[PDB]
Symmetry: C5
Subunit: 261 residues, 5 copies
């Protein structure tokens, strides 16, 4: 895989797509592939009944976790030419939450808490690394693909850390992190904010682009004719339910790249 020069940006050598990627929340019902919930509001987080021996901090309902969202783009068909993602815009679809959250005797409720803002854009699926937040965290007993291994040994990156590729919408954001040792031909960016009551701050607009060229001036190459978008966003909780943007918008700019073959 040797990279040559960019093709002169022409009408039939350029390609643009806009798309909205929906947020994903886990599904407790068992089906045939499990179905994602496209929700921007989860079920309530709460300790189970007195008698029950399910510990919600160890095995939460799939209902109350966010998984990475997925989308694939196959640009039109074309000493070899391949599609190159050289820039993009991405923007969050978001409204302020006030009235919908209710009030306690006129004290307005608000959206706040632990947050994630993540996007990834690559010529193959996102390489991910399996982790536990706690010595006792197993994940949901349905829907989610949980990291294989003893939770007591996975709260640190070690030789037994499991690796995986985000090829379905079943990877919980609380259990899998992007693998910085892999993800070649891929740009990603993530921001985690902790705290129980941390206000989320989101900006959006329509006159701002993200360049995607590396140190050599090479963007993402679609070597198998596909671009893999993977992303996840979490704004905090409100009334014990996790909230998400209504969507993550992408506009992708492709040119053509010469590759030796």
């Amino acid at each position: 895989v040797e990279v040559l020069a960019a093709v002169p940006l022409s009408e039939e050598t350029e390609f643009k797509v806009e798309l909205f990627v929906k947020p994903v929340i886990g599904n407790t019902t068992a089906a045939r592939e499990p179905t994602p919930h496209y929700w921007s509001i989860s079920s309530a987080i709460h300790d189970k009944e007195s008698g029950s021996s399910i510990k919600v901090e160890e095995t939460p309902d799939a209902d109350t976790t966010v998984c990475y969202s997925l989308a694939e783009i196959a640009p039109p068909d074309i000493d070899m030419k391949v599609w190159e993602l050289y820039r993009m815009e991405t923007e969050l679809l978001v409204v302020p939450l006030v009235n919908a959250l209710g009030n306690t005797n006129g004290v307005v409720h608000g959206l706040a808490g632990t947050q994630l803002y993540f996007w990834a854009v690559g010529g193959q699926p996102l390489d991910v690394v399996g982790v536990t937040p706690t010595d006792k965290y197993k994940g949901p007993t349905t829907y989610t693909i949980n990291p294989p291994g003893d939770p007591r040994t996975l709260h640190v990156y070690n030789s037994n850390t499991p690796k995986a590729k985000v090829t379905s919408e079943r990877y919980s954001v609380e259990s899998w992190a992007p693998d910085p040792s892999r993800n070649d031909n891929c740009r990603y960016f993530g921001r985690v904010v902790g705290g129980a009551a941390t206000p989320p701050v989101v900006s959006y607009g329509n006159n701002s682009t993200i360049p995607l060229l590396d140190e050599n001036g090479i963007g993402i190459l679609c070597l198998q004719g596909r671009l893999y978008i993977t992303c996840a966003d979490m704004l905090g909780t409100a009334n014990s339910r996790i909230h998400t943007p209504m969507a993550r918008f992408f506009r992708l700019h492709f040119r053509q790249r010469r590759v030796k073959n």
Copy 2:
């Protein structure tokens, strides 16, 4: 489409200053179009008497929501040349709120909470997208144009998400977000801050401009001889009432653009 800019001359330039008033929903039914409240302080958010079946978190009073504000500018006739907005300044009209908020045994009350800061500037009305914050949010039963559809399916961007254009001051800021897939010939910018007690931070001054040229050096073109200003700003709540800046100021700079016809 677009040719060269006309040499900046006295006859070929045009400037306007204006203040855009904030909009709050009106509970009284009209006689005639519904009338906006130009208020920077809403009615109190509070639950109904425990007998009542109106759920304020599902159908709030129009009284307690902010809608997008509107203004149109028609620059003077031209004796095809078209008006082009190439830069502007916009500034919030704001004072600190201290004494007016009262106190509790000398404990000074403050303005804080969930915030929005938004402006848009375009050759046509703002393209907007209909959304729900909750699986149960319907919006006010009067005044507001609410997003058509089942609230259970609108909390995520999907094939059923309704589209609209902000052509009246009846679009609640809690239900409609700018459409990033549209809004060509338009620049907008939005910031949303969550939280129930988040302090607002506003800066203002008179020596700062916003350039409005795109990647090609083209500003907003008034193809039908009009510029559409649409904006909304929310600073938080105080004593259960939402506050807004007293106004949003704009100064618009137009030159003339030669256009192939």
Copy 3:
């Protein structure tokens, strides 16, 4: 009509340093400003009283814009303010605030940081924060009009020039539609418990040239400084910096006719 700058010479340059004092309203019977950096306590009146403190507070508990004028030496040619430094005079408040059983009290709350510099007084716009806010019954020049109609900028919005130290910062905001030949900058921070953050130093300047390279022109031979700063409250009293420092740099400008 503005011409070229005069070559920077010894007699064509002028510098002044000054401290501008904060202003708090005065309840007693021109009315005299209180030059205080700490106000009276905000509290409701006794139960019997018909005075509503959120509608008509004591002048005692509000900050008004501070004023200073500078007339550079006599010299056609006119004095031009082309740069300045401004800096807040400030100390951390710890012991002075007291404590509740060892829990140290702090300064926090709603803030304003504002300065303006112009060849005429600051153009200001009258506003109400509430449908019911009238302002203090003495000292302050309150915005004329029904409070129910002034919480939004409209036709009834009164205009005024800051020509005395009686303009409450809670009722008057700089007019962005006017204030030609003037730079100003303001920051407002809300919240009841918001920590103030203030930086200061002595190696930082603010340029004051506009898009044309023209600073503030003293067309009537005067420079008008107007400013106000509020750090929050402590024990129900509003605090201010001890002063706002300015150093002004003037050159000469040829103004045609």
Copy 4:
């Protein structure tokens, strides 16, 4: 009377590193120079035993206030000078560790350091020019150790003609009573940040690959006209369990070249 810089040479350059200790007031009284406490943790702030007439918000124990720290540097003599030493750049860096276990807990609830903060340094060819101020209409300062601003506290909470001036020539100037004088301090660089609030988290960065240039608009640094450089500084991170905390030290590395003068 400033001329050109001397060509950077081995003999014409000079570097020093030093740690400046934080200063807290000392209650044990005078007769003789009072002794500073070099502490990064003060005594507890608390009201006196009920019935007492000492008001801690008006006259606190010297124990519970931070004073400006001092250090002087005299670079080596200049074989037949007039050439003078010029501080043209420096690095300064806070010596700091996160406080967790040491702060204790309340039924498993970890205590933290938070509160009102100051971060200040000054570097000059003479002592720091300072201005006397009161935070309150009733604040007198500690009845021992500290040099308190002269005047009625009711008239000192604003800068006016009654504002006393002083030079930081001892480690007895309380940070709560004296602020750098922006109308003076020629041949001096200083920088200060004040953060209010009772529970404000401090944020401190440090590293070893970052310098602060000290040249003014003319390309002139601090000139040691009497052969000395005066370092004055103070840093406060907040409180923990009613005691004020400080960095363990403020580090400086100073870079001198020589400046020719007439």
Copy 5:
């Protein structure tokens, strides 16, 4: 010693390594070298039983403190390393470092449906050097001794160590036993070393961590010289603390490094 010119970037003269450095928490159990816990979650901080005399704010369990993590890199041996006039040595000229982190929500539990969060006092620190990190011994309190096992505590009276003075002990981070609450990097030393640290106080302060894969940190000094591996080794030392949750300290799952070496000429 006397640094000469960089060797022309070649295939033969370049070297890259990626590695993950594990966080370190103290170990209470006990003969040989004490074993670090590679945990991103500590034991609970709690006072002892009302009948005990161990004061947890003076001598905490090794269990509840973070120590500096260590890693060493020895790049490949150099062909024709020494000549008449000079020798070639490995020079670290840039790196990327990135935290391995996930949001903690469900794992933290809840009280009546009020979701728990990770918050509190934080440290973000990395160091990269041709020798071990020079560190300075300090006390946060006039009474803090540190854990009675595992940790190498600063020698001296705690009453005199809460300030930098002539009694301040110096040390090199040569094992994973230096508690982050007792030892700070020495700015008066650490030549041929770049380090960077951020401390955030407060009991309830939210941590904010960014990560990505298109950002590098240059490591050249004022002269254009990076870290020189004069004894053929690069020493990585680092520590990161995100706050507490349910009385236990949390850490990133790891700190990732990618190191870029070229060759540097040096007069012997």
